[PDB]
């Protein structure tokens, strides 16, 4: 809704942006080899991401609304995620998109399924986690904060509010696949 055409830009190992991303990945995934790291440049998707962030910022106070989190997926999904991000298109904590604090969660073969050539795919994603609570299975949206004021909902949900290892997001444009890590065993 807008075409959200994208460019994919490989970064070189010398690039500081490469190392920022590789370093975060390497905290838990050093034992894998990284074949490449790309930036996904999709200006329509980014513009719609930045619009929801502006809204979230003007609303959540001192809160750092954005976290950078990981998401493993199969090779088939990579061009979908590039065009559309994490679109509306079951589970423990709700029916939305799952993101992980630590790369080794996403690196599991059940998420980042290895292709024919053994390549695995993990995105390093800007996610608007905002204000979060503990989730549950039947959430098709996050719960309301106050029952007296029931339209202001939580922004995301999590497994553990003081020690999260995962977050679930439900809305469109709440997440931007800024980087794709292609790697192998
Ligand atoms: N993938 C990860 O790196 C990761 C990180 C933390 C936790 C988890 N996963 C879990 O704990 C269990 C995940 C699970 O059982 N189901 C989630 C999969 C799912 C997401 N959706 C939402 C539909 N929107 S969609 O466009 O098809 C979509 C959305 C987001 C990602 C994809 C994708 O291609 O990966 C697709 N429907 N099913 C994964």
From Swiss-Prot:
Superkingdom of source: Eukaryota
PARP catalytic domain residues: 1-185
PTM entry text: Auto-ADP-ribosylated.
Regulation: induction: Up-regulated by IFNG in macrophages. Down-regulated by IL4 in macrophages.
Cysteine disulfide links: none
Tissue specificity remark: Expressed in macrophages.
Subcellular location: Nucleus; Cytoplasm
Subunit structure: Interacts with STAT6. Interacts with PARP10. Interacts with PARP9 in IFNG-stimulated macrophages; the interaction prevents PARP14-mediated STAT1 and STAT6 ADP-riboslylation.
Entry function: ADP-ribosyltransferase that mediates mono-ADP-ribosylation of glutamate residues on target proteins. In contrast to PARP1 and PARP2, it is not able to mediate poly-ADP-ribosylation. Has been shown to catalyze the mono-ADP-ribosylation of STAT1 at 'Glu-657' and 'Glu-705', thus decreasing STAT1 phosphorylation which negatively regulates pro-inflammatory cytokine production in macrophages in response to IFNG stimulation.
Similarity section: Belongs to the ARTD/PARP family.
Protein name: Protein mono-ADP-ribosyltransferase PARP14
Part of the full-length chain shown: 1612 to 1801 of 1801
């Amino acid at each position: 809704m807008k075409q959200q055409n994208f460019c994919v830009v490989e970064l070189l190992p010398s690039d500081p942006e490469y190392n920022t991303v590789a370093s975060k990945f390497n905290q838990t995934c050093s034992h894998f080899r990284i074949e490449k790291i790309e930036r996904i440049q999709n200006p329509d998707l980014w513009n719609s991401y930045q619009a929801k962030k502006k809204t979230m910022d003007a609303k959540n106070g001192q809160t750092m609304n954005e976290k950078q989190l990981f998401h493993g997926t199969d090779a088939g999904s990579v061009p979908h995620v590039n065009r559309n991000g994490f679109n509306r298109s079951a589970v423990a904590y709700g029916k939305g998109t799952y993101f992980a604090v630590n790369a080794n969660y996403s690196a599991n073969d059940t998420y980042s399924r290895p292709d024919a050539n053994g390549r695995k795919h993990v995105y390093y994603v800007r996610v608007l986690t905002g204000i979060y609570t503990h989730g549950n299975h039947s959430l098709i949206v996050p719960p309301s904060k106050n029952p007296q004021n029931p339209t202001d909902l939580y922004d995301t949900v999590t497994d553990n509010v003081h020690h999260p290892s995962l977050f679930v997001a439900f809305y469109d444009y709440q997440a931007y696949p800024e980087y794709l890590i292609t790697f192998r065993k």
